[PDB]
Amino acid sequence: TDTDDAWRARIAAHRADKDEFLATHDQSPIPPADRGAFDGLRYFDIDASFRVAARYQPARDPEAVELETTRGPPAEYTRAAVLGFDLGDSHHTLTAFRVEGESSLFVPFTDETTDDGRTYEHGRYLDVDPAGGDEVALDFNLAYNPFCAYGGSFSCALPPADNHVPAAITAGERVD
Amino acid sequence: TDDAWRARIAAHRADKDEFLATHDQSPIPPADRGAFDGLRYFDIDASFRVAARYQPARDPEAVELETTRGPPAEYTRAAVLGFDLGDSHHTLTAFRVEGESSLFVPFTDETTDDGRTYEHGRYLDVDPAGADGGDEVALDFNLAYNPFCAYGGSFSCALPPADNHVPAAITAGERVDADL
Ligand code: EMC
Ligand code: EMC
Ligand code: NA
Ligand code: NA
Numbered sequence: 001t002d003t004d005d006a007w008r009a010r011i012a013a014h015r016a017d018k019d020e021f022l023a024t025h026d027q028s029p030i031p032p033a034d035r036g037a038f039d040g041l042r043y044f045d046i047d048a049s050f051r052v053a054a055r056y057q058p059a060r061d062p063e064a065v066e067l068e069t070t071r072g073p074p075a076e077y078t079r080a081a082v083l084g085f086d087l088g089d090s091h092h093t094l095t096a097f098r099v100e101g102e103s104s105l106f107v108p109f110t111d112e113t114t115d116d117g118r119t120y121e122h123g124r125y126l127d128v129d130p131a132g133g134d135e136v137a138l139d140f141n142l143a144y145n146p147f148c149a150y151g152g153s154f155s156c157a158l159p160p161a162d163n164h165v166p167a168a169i170t171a172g173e174r175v176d
Numbered sequence: 177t178d179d180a181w182r183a184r185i186a187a188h189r190a191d192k193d194e195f196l197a198t199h200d201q202s203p204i205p206p207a208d209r210g211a212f213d214g215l216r217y218f219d220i221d222a223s224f225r226v227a228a229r230y231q232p233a234r235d236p237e238a239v240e241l242e243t244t245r246g247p248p249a250e251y252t253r254a255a256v257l258g259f260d261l262g263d264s265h266h267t268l269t270a271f272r273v274e275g276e277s278s279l280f281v282p283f284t285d286e287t288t289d290d291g292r293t294y295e296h297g298r299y300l301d302v303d304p305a306g307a308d309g310g311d312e313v314a315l316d317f318n319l320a321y322n323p324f325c326a327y328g329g330s331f332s333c334a335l336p337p338a339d340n341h342v343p344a345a346i347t348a349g350e351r352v353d354a355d356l
Contacts, residue, residue, distance in 0.1 A: 072247055153242075 008046055011141055015043060022150075029147040029154065041145075042176040050140040050171030054094075055084040058133050062098065067108070070122060070148050072155035080105055083128065085138055087167045094163050096128055105130050108159035109143075111169040119174050120149045123159040126172075143172025182220050185318055189217060196327075203324040203331065216351045220318050224348035228259035228315040230307040236272065241282070241334040244296065244325050249334045254279055255304065259315050261344050268315075268340050270302055279304050282336035283320075285346040291354045294326045297336040298349060320349025 019040040022028045058081045066074035077097035084093050096105035110123035124143040146156035193214040196202045232255045240248035254272035270279040284297040298320040323333035
């Protein structure tokens, strides 16, 4: 059913609504001081080569694991699965984490844009709907920054070294 | 004289380059040790060796400083140092660190802002013993040095508190090359 227009519209609508929340809402992660001057998040333009199908390889025996955080004690996740996918000509894997009380898998990553400074230095996050082992949708046009990227003092989970993708993921949120 | 003082400072900078350049425990990442060409300093200027009024905390309090990585660092607020640079008066808060006899004085100045010295600020060690209020202690900004993370390693170093900004160009002690 889903048209390309529908998908692009959905992404557009999401980035606009998000901008609105960040710019005006009391619980916005943008520090109050900087809200007036806030001009919207920066994004790569939408790109379908970064909207890929991932093979879902669930953890045989889901394991309690922890990720470093930027300002705090390590955060506790369950290793939930391996996501396997292709970007252009190369195959990649990312570990997906189960978060208590959240239905989507948490997939923090870094890529070559992390390294060259086009995207956030500590990396980016992707949410992935597990429902219900087979193939899931990996849309890096939906990659977003951790809260701490906006100046406030938040302790956020850091991507494991194993979740670096050796490729330029020119999709999703950037920092300009 | 100024000569013994200059010599001692010059000796310290040399020995420190030596250590950074060749020692296994150097904060210079192993990858860059061979290319390493020494730290960078402003020339030794006696106008930045000032007498500071020691004003000890009446009731020293546990405080926290933000760090470059990981949780805040825990220190005790031990004293205010008040001093003049050069026609203007300033105060810096000095911190007592567990197990170290010298007070820790992390700071920033206009060289931080203009990019001539390290972006996160610089550190100064000050020997408190055995001064009362208000005895003088020597504040020698020629001895200002960089946090470990200035060299590229992924260290956790304490950030100077906001009120430890000195509104002046402290052209003494360790500097950085911005072009690198
Ligand atoms: C972006 C979660 Hg602190
Ligand atoms: C310079 C302390 Hg990591
Ligand atoms: Na976030
Ligand atoms: Na240091």
